[PDB]
Amino acid sequence: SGEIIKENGKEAIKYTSSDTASHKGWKATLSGTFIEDPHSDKKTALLNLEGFIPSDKQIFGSKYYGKMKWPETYRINVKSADVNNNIKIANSIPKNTIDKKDVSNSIGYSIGGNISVVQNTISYEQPDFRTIQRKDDANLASWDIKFVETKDGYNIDSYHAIYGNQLFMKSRLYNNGDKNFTDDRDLSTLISGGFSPNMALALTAPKNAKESVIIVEYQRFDNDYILNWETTQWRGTNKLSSTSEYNEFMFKINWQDHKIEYYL
Ligand SMILES: [Mg+2]
Numbered sequence: 001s002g003e004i005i006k007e008n009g010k011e012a013i014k015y016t017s018s019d020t021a022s023h024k025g026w027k028a029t030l031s032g033t034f035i036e037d038p039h040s041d042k043k044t045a046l047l048n049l050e051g052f053i054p055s056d057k058q059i060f061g062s063k064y065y066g067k068m069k070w071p072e073t074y075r076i077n078v079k080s081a082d083v084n085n086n087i088k089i090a091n092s093i094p095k096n097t098i099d100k101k102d103v104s105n106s107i108g109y110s111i112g113g114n115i116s117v118v119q120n121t122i123s124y125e126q127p128d129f130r131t132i133q134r135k136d137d138a139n140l141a142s143w144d145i146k147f148v149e150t151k152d153g154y155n156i157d158s159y160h161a162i163y164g165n166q167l168f169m170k171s172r173l174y175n176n177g178d179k180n181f182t183d184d185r186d187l188s189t190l191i192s193g194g195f196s197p198n199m200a201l202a203l204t205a206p207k208n209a210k211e212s213v214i215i216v217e218y219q220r221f222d223n224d225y226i227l228n229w230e231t232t233q234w235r236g237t238n239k240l241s242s243t244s245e246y247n248e249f250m251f252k253i254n255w256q257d258h259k260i261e262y263y264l
Pocket residue numbers: 019020262
């Protein structure tokens with residue numbers, strides 16, 4: 001069931017697998033390309049994570065008061081574990097910090113074992129946010145997709161002596177509280193809808209490896225953007241929410257059978 005790959009007069013065999021899991025609208029699809037390379041002294045799998053984390057944006061309020069809960073940071077952790085601590089994340093994308101709305105890069109495998117950043121390409125959008133790769137070691141790759149500023153240039157630190165933080169304030173003078181937040185069509189899709197992460201990595205294993213595990217951890221840190229009517233105008237305040245949300249998905253990396261298998 002393997003396919004021959006060729007490069008510079010050398011050949012190897014590749015195998016593909018994928019599995020997917022979801023819970024409460026949070027989704028993780030982990031796809032793999034396993035390489036059995038006679039020209040390398042280890043085994044490698046390129047893994048591609050695609051998923052979705054709902055924004056859970058919510059608005060509450062009344063005539064003089066409003067609260068908008070919104071996602072300030074999405075955190076994605078991908079952890080590798082195995083009983084003999086032999087299997088390592090060799091590299092992962094995206095790297096460093098990316099402020100561009102469209103994130104796109106590739107991780108490639110060369111026959112002989114070289115990994116460069118057979119290929120896996122990632123792509124996602126992050127309007128008004130940035131991606132910070134916060135961890136990149138042998139057993140953890142982690143990324144924060146963190147809010148930067150609205151198109152109007154308001155951020156979580158913005159402060160006006162009268163209006164406070166105007167972050168998602170629709171009008172200084174008008175509207176009831178629950179009707180005074182930025183419309184969905186004027187918000188980043190990461191706030192109105194959610195985030196669609198796409199990250200990738202390369203795992204390296206000893207030749208005799210039969211199984212390991214990948215754990216995908218999703219965390220969404222919410223903030224509360226609050227409006228209070230102050231006699232003649234609205235005043236906004238942004239703070240950390242007292243709640244955040246978390247979901248994780250574990251996948252067996254079945255090196256022996258070249259399969260990715262979600263653990264129920
Ligand atoms: Mg399945």
